[PDB]
Amino acid sequence: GSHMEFMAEQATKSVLFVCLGNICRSPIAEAVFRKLVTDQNISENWRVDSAATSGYEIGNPPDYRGQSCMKRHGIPMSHVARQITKEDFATFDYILCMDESNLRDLNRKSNQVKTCKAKIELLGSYDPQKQLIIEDPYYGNDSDFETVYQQCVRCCRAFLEKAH
Known part of the structure:
Protein backbone atom coordinates (compact mmCIF):
# COMPACT_ATOMS: atom_id res chain seq x y z
CA GLY A 1 0.00 0.00 0.00
CA SER A 2 1.02 3.61 0.57
CA HIS A 3 4.45 4.69 1.80
CA MET A 4 2.39 6.96 4.21
CA GLU A 5 0.29 4.01 5.52
CA PHE A 6 2.48 3.48 8.64
CA MET A 7 5.12 5.69 10.38
CA ALA A 8 7.89 6.71 7.94
CA GLU A 9 10.57 4.05 7.52
CA GLN A 10 13.83 4.15 9.49
CA ALA A 11 17.13 4.36 7.64
CA THR A 12 18.40 0.83 7.46
CA LYS A 13 20.52 -0.30 10.43
CA SER A 14 23.37 -2.78 10.01
CA VAL A 15 25.04 -5.26 12.38
CA LEU A 16 27.91 -7.66 11.69
CA PHE A 17 28.65 -10.46 14.21
CA VAL A 18 32.27 -11.65 14.33
CA CYS A 19 34.41 -14.47 15.77
CA LEU A 20 37.79 -15.98 14.77
CA GLY A 21 36.42 -18.64 12.46
CA ASN A 22 32.79 -17.70 11.59
CA ILE A 23 31.50 -21.24 12.15
CA CYS A 24 30.48 -21.42 15.90
CA ARG A 25 29.45 -18.33 17.88
CA SER A 26 29.02 -15.60 15.23
CA PRO A 27 26.60 -17.48 12.88
CA ILE A 28 24.48 -18.43 15.91
CA ALA A 29 24.19 -14.75 16.96
CA GLU A 30 23.41 -13.80 13.35
CA ALA A 31 20.55 -16.29 12.98
CA VAL A 32 19.21 -15.31 16.48
CA PHE A 33 19.20 -11.59 15.57
CA ARG A 34 17.69 -12.32 12.14
CA LYS A 35 14.82 -14.28 13.74
CA GLU A 100 38.82 -10.33 24.10
CA SER A 101 41.16 -11.93 21.53
CA ASN A 102 38.46 -10.99 18.97
CA LEU A 103 38.38 -7.38 20.15
CA ARG A 104 42.18 -6.89 20.04
CA ASP A 105 42.29 -8.35 16.52
CA LEU A 106 39.45 -6.18 15.19
CA ASN A 107 40.96 -3.15 16.89
CA ARG A 108 44.23 -3.88 15.07
CA LYS A 109 42.30 -4.16 11.80
CA SER A 110 40.25 -0.96 12.40
CA ASN A 111 43.47 0.99 12.35
CA GLN A 112 44.56 -0.29 8.92
CA VAL A 113 41.48 1.19 7.08
CA LYS A 114 40.58 4.76 5.94
CA THR A 115 36.97 4.96 7.20
CA CYS A 116 35.86 2.98 10.30
CA LYS A 117 32.21 3.81 10.71
CA ALA A 118 31.49 0.84 12.91
CA LYS A 119 31.22 0.88 16.74
CA ILE A 120 33.33 -2.15 17.75
CA GLU A 121 32.03 -3.81 20.95
CA LEU A 122 31.74 -7.11 22.73
CA LEU A 123 28.29 -8.62 22.22
CA GLY A 124 28.14 -9.62 25.94
CA SER A 125 28.59 -5.97 26.88
CA TYR A 126 24.79 -5.98 26.16
CA ASP A 127 23.89 -8.85 28.52
CA PRO A 128 21.59 -7.74 31.36
CA GLN A 129 23.06 -10.59 33.48
CA LYS A 130 26.56 -9.12 32.91
CA GLN A 131 28.16 -12.18 31.33
CA LEU A 132 30.75 -10.30 29.33
CA ILE A 133 32.59 -12.97 27.49
CA ILE A 134 30.72 -15.40 25.22
CA GLU A 135 33.08 -18.36 25.58
CA ASP A 136 34.27 -20.43 22.64
CA PRO A 137 32.41 -23.75 22.45
CA TYR A 138 34.78 -25.23 19.77
CA TYR A 139 36.37 -27.56 22.37
CA GLY A 140 33.14 -27.95 24.41
CA ASN A 141 29.96 -30.03 24.37
CA ASP A 142 26.24 -29.60 23.70
CA SER A 143 25.61 -27.59 26.92
CA ASP A 144 28.33 -25.07 25.91
CA PHE A 145 26.51 -24.43 22.62
CA GLU A 146 23.20 -24.09 24.54
CA THR A 147 24.86 -21.55 26.86
CA VAL A 148 26.15 -19.51 23.92
CA TYR A 149 22.71 -19.65 22.29
CA GLN A 150 20.97 -18.38 25.50
CA GLN A 151 23.60 -15.59 25.96
CA CYS A 152 22.96 -14.65 22.34
CA VAL A 153 19.21 -14.38 22.93
CA ARG A 154 19.69 -12.08 25.94
CA CYS A 155 22.33 -9.93 24.24
CA CYS A 156 20.65 -9.60 20.80
CA ARG A 157 17.38 -8.69 22.50
CA ALA A 158 18.93 -5.92 24.61
CA PHE A 159 20.97 -4.77 21.61
CA LEU A 160 17.87 -4.56 19.40
CA GLU A 161 16.00 -2.57 22.05
CA LYS A 162 18.76 -0.19 23.00
CA ALA A 163 22.03 0.19 21.05
CA HIS A 164 25.20 1.68 22.67
Missing part, protein backbone atom coordinates in the same frame (compact mmCIF):
# COMPACT_ATOMS: atom_id res chain seq x y z
CA LEU A 36 14.04 -11.38 16.07
CA VAL A 37 13.84 -8.81 13.30
CA THR A 38 11.90 -11.08 10.99
CA ASP A 39 9.39 -11.93 13.74
CA GLN A 40 8.90 -8.20 14.57
CA ASN A 41 8.20 -7.11 10.91
CA ILE A 42 11.44 -5.12 10.64
CA SER A 43 13.88 -7.29 8.70
CA GLU A 44 13.61 -4.83 5.78
CA ASN A 45 15.19 -2.21 8.11
CA TRP A 46 18.23 -4.35 8.98
CA ARG A 47 21.30 -5.54 7.17
CA VAL A 48 22.38 -8.54 9.19
CA ASP A 49 25.55 -10.65 8.56
CA SER A 50 28.51 -12.54 10.12
CA ALA A 51 32.22 -12.91 9.38
CA ALA A 52 35.60 -14.17 10.62
CA THR A 53 38.80 -12.41 11.73
CA SER A 54 40.79 -15.17 9.92
CA GLY A 55 40.49 -17.07 6.68
CA TYR A 56 40.81 -20.61 8.26
CA GLU A 57 37.16 -21.60 7.63
CA ILE A 58 36.25 -19.71 4.39
CA GLY A 59 33.37 -21.42 2.52
CA ASN A 60 32.41 -23.73 5.34
CA PRO A 61 28.93 -24.14 6.73
CA PRO A 62 28.30 -23.67 10.48
CA ASP A 63 29.53 -26.18 13.00
CA TYR A 64 27.13 -29.21 12.85
CA ARG A 65 26.98 -29.18 16.64
CA GLY A 66 25.77 -25.56 16.68
CA GLN A 67 23.42 -26.31 13.80
CA SER A 68 21.84 -29.14 15.85
CA CYS A 69 21.39 -26.76 18.81
CA MET A 70 19.74 -24.13 16.56
CA LYS A 71 17.52 -26.77 14.94
CA ARG A 72 16.33 -27.77 18.43
CA HIS A 73 15.41 -24.11 18.98
CA GLY A 74 13.71 -23.94 15.53
CA ILE A 75 16.25 -21.55 13.82
CA PRO A 76 18.26 -23.45 11.20
CA MET A 77 21.33 -21.53 10.04
CA SER A 78 22.06 -20.95 6.38
CA HIS A 79 25.59 -19.41 6.23
CA VAL A 80 28.81 -19.73 4.30
CA ALA A 81 31.87 -18.79 6.44
CA ARG A 82 33.57 -15.62 5.20
CA GLN A 83 36.42 -13.37 6.34
CA ILE A 84 35.95 -9.77 7.31
CA THR A 85 36.83 -7.09 4.69
CA LYS A 86 37.92 -3.45 4.83
CA GLU A 87 34.56 -2.42 3.35
CA ASP A 88 32.85 -4.06 6.38
CA PHE A 89 34.45 -1.43 8.71
CA ALA A 90 33.16 1.39 6.52
CA THR A 91 29.62 -0.14 6.03
CA PHE A 92 28.31 -1.54 9.35
CA ASP A 93 26.96 0.58 12.22
CA TYR A 94 27.99 -2.19 14.60
CA ILE A 95 30.57 -4.91 14.70
CA LEU A 96 29.85 -7.10 17.69
CA CYS A 97 32.35 -9.73 18.71
CA MET A 98 32.48 -12.56 21.28
CA ASP A 99 35.74 -12.34 23.24
Whole structure:
Protein backbone atom coordinates (compact mmCIF):
# COMPACT_ATOMS: atom_id res chain seq x y z
CA GLY A 1 0.00 0.00 0.00
CA SER A 2 1.02 3.61 0.57
CA HIS A 3 4.45 4.69 1.80
CA MET A 4 2.39 6.96 4.21
CA GLU A 5 0.29 4.01 5.52
CA PHE A 6 2.48 3.48 8.64
CA MET A 7 5.12 5.69 10.38
CA ALA A 8 7.89 6.71 7.94
CA GLU A 9 10.57 4.05 7.52
CA GLN A 10 13.83 4.15 9.49
CA ALA A 11 17.13 4.36 7.64
CA THR A 12 18.40 0.83 7.46
CA LYS A 13 20.52 -0.30 10.43
CA SER A 14 23.37 -2.78 10.01
CA VAL A 15 25.04 -5.26 12.38
CA LEU A 16 27.91 -7.66 11.69
CA PHE A 17 28.65 -10.46 14.21
CA VAL A 18 32.27 -11.65 14.33
CA CYS A 19 34.41 -14.47 15.77
CA LEU A 20 37.79 -15.98 14.77
CA GLY A 21 36.42 -18.64 12.46
CA ASN A 22 32.79 -17.70 11.59
CA ILE A 23 31.50 -21.24 12.15
CA CYS A 24 30.48 -21.42 15.90
CA ARG A 25 29.45 -18.33 17.88
CA SER A 26 29.02 -15.60 15.23
CA PRO A 27 26.60 -17.48 12.88
CA ILE A 28 24.48 -18.43 15.91
CA ALA A 29 24.19 -14.75 16.96
CA GLU A 30 23.41 -13.80 13.35
CA ALA A 31 20.55 -16.29 12.98
CA VAL A 32 19.21 -15.31 16.48
CA PHE A 33 19.20 -11.59 15.57
CA ARG A 34 17.69 -12.32 12.14
CA LYS A 35 14.82 -14.28 13.74
CA LEU A 36 14.04 -11.38 16.07
CA VAL A 37 13.84 -8.81 13.30
CA THR A 38 11.90 -11.08 10.99
CA ASP A 39 9.39 -11.93 13.74
CA GLN A 40 8.90 -8.20 14.57
CA ASN A 41 8.20 -7.11 10.91
CA ILE A 42 11.44 -5.12 10.64
CA SER A 43 13.88 -7.29 8.70
CA GLU A 44 13.61 -4.83 5.78
CA ASN A 45 15.19 -2.21 8.11
CA TRP A 46 18.23 -4.35 8.98
CA ARG A 47 21.30 -5.54 7.17
CA VAL A 48 22.38 -8.54 9.19
CA ASP A 49 25.55 -10.65 8.56
CA SER A 50 28.51 -12.54 10.12
CA ALA A 51 32.22 -12.91 9.38
CA ALA A 52 35.60 -14.17 10.62
CA THR A 53 38.80 -12.41 11.73
CA SER A 54 40.79 -15.17 9.92
CA GLY A 55 40.49 -17.07 6.68
CA TYR A 56 40.81 -20.61 8.26
CA GLU A 57 37.16 -21.60 7.63
CA ILE A 58 36.25 -19.71 4.39
CA GLY A 59 33.37 -21.42 2.52
CA ASN A 60 32.41 -23.73 5.34
CA PRO A 61 28.93 -24.14 6.73
CA PRO A 62 28.30 -23.67 10.48
CA ASP A 63 29.53 -26.18 13.00
CA TYR A 64 27.13 -29.21 12.85
CA ARG A 65 26.98 -29.18 16.64
CA GLY A 66 25.77 -25.56 16.68
CA GLN A 67 23.42 -26.31 13.80
CA SER A 68 21.84 -29.14 15.85
CA CYS A 69 21.39 -26.76 18.81
CA MET A 70 19.74 -24.13 16.56
CA LYS A 71 17.52 -26.77 14.94
CA ARG A 72 16.33 -27.77 18.43
CA HIS A 73 15.41 -24.11 18.98
CA GLY A 74 13.71 -23.94 15.53
CA ILE A 75 16.25 -21.55 13.82
CA PRO A 76 18.26 -23.45 11.20
CA MET A 77 21.33 -21.53 10.04
CA SER A 78 22.06 -20.95 6.38
CA HIS A 79 25.59 -19.41 6.23
CA VAL A 80 28.81 -19.73 4.30
CA ALA A 81 31.87 -18.79 6.44
CA ARG A 82 33.57 -15.62 5.20
CA GLN A 83 36.42 -13.37 6.34
CA ILE A 84 35.95 -9.77 7.31
CA THR A 85 36.83 -7.09 4.69
CA LYS A 86 37.92 -3.45 4.83
CA GLU A 87 34.56 -2.42 3.35
CA ASP A 88 32.85 -4.06 6.38
CA PHE A 89 34.45 -1.43 8.71
CA ALA A 90 33.16 1.39 6.52
CA THR A 91 29.62 -0.14 6.03
CA PHE A 92 28.31 -1.54 9.35
CA ASP A 93 26.96 0.58 12.22
CA TYR A 94 27.99 -2.19 14.60
CA ILE A 95 30.57 -4.91 14.70
CA LEU A 96 29.85 -7.10 17.69
CA CYS A 97 32.35 -9.73 18.71
CA MET A 98 32.48 -12.56 21.28
CA ASP A 99 35.74 -12.34 23.24
CA GLU A 100 38.82 -10.33 24.10
CA SER A 101 41.16 -11.93 21.53
CA ASN A 102 38.46 -10.99 18.97
CA LEU A 103 38.38 -7.38 20.15
CA ARG A 104 42.18 -6.89 20.04
CA ASP A 105 42.29 -8.35 16.52
CA LEU A 106 39.45 -6.18 15.19
CA ASN A 107 40.96 -3.15 16.89
CA ARG A 108 44.23 -3.88 15.07
CA LYS A 109 42.30 -4.16 11.80
CA SER A 110 40.25 -0.96 12.40
CA ASN A 111 43.47 0.99 12.35
CA GLN A 112 44.56 -0.29 8.92
CA VAL A 113 41.48 1.19 7.08
CA LYS A 114 40.58 4.76 5.94
CA THR A 115 36.97 4.96 7.20
CA CYS A 116 35.86 2.98 10.30
CA LYS A 117 32.21 3.81 10.71
CA ALA A 118 31.49 0.84 12.91
CA LYS A 119 31.22 0.88 16.74
CA ILE A 120 33.33 -2.15 17.75
CA GLU A 121 32.03 -3.81 20.95
CA LEU A 122 31.74 -7.11 22.73
CA LEU A 123 28.29 -8.62 22.22
CA GLY A 124 28.14 -9.62 25.94
CA SER A 125 28.59 -5.97 26.88
CA TYR A 126 24.79 -5.98 26.16
CA ASP A 127 23.89 -8.85 28.52
CA PRO A 128 21.59 -7.74 31.36
CA GLN A 129 23.06 -10.59 33.48
CA LYS A 130 26.56 -9.12 32.91
CA GLN A 131 28.16 -12.18 31.33
CA LEU A 132 30.75 -10.30 29.33
CA ILE A 133 32.59 -12.97 27.49
CA ILE A 134 30.72 -15.40 25.22
CA GLU A 135 33.08 -18.36 25.58
CA ASP A 136 34.27 -20.43 22.64
CA PRO A 137 32.41 -23.75 22.45
CA TYR A 138 34.78 -25.23 19.77
CA TYR A 139 36.37 -27.56 22.37
CA GLY A 140 33.14 -27.95 24.41
CA ASN A 141 29.96 -30.03 24.37
CA ASP A 142 26.24 -29.60 23.70
CA SER A 143 25.61 -27.59 26.92
CA ASP A 144 28.33 -25.07 25.91
CA PHE A 145 26.51 -24.43 22.62
CA GLU A 146 23.20 -24.09 24.54
CA THR A 147 24.86 -21.55 26.86
CA VAL A 148 26.15 -19.51 23.92
CA TYR A 149 22.71 -19.65 22.29
CA GLN A 150 20.97 -18.38 25.50
CA GLN A 151 23.60 -15.59 25.96
CA CYS A 152 22.96 -14.65 22.34
CA VAL A 153 19.21 -14.38 22.93
CA ARG A 154 19.69 -12.08 25.94
CA CYS A 155 22.33 -9.93 24.24
CA CYS A 156 20.65 -9.60 20.80
CA ARG A 157 17.38 -8.69 22.50
CA ALA A 158 18.93 -5.92 24.61
CA PHE A 159 20.97 -4.77 21.61
CA LEU A 160 17.87 -4.56 19.40
CA GLU A 161 16.00 -2.57 22.05
CA LYS A 162 18.76 -0.19 23.00
CA ALA A 163 22.03 0.19 21.05
CA HIS A 164 25.20 1.68 22.67
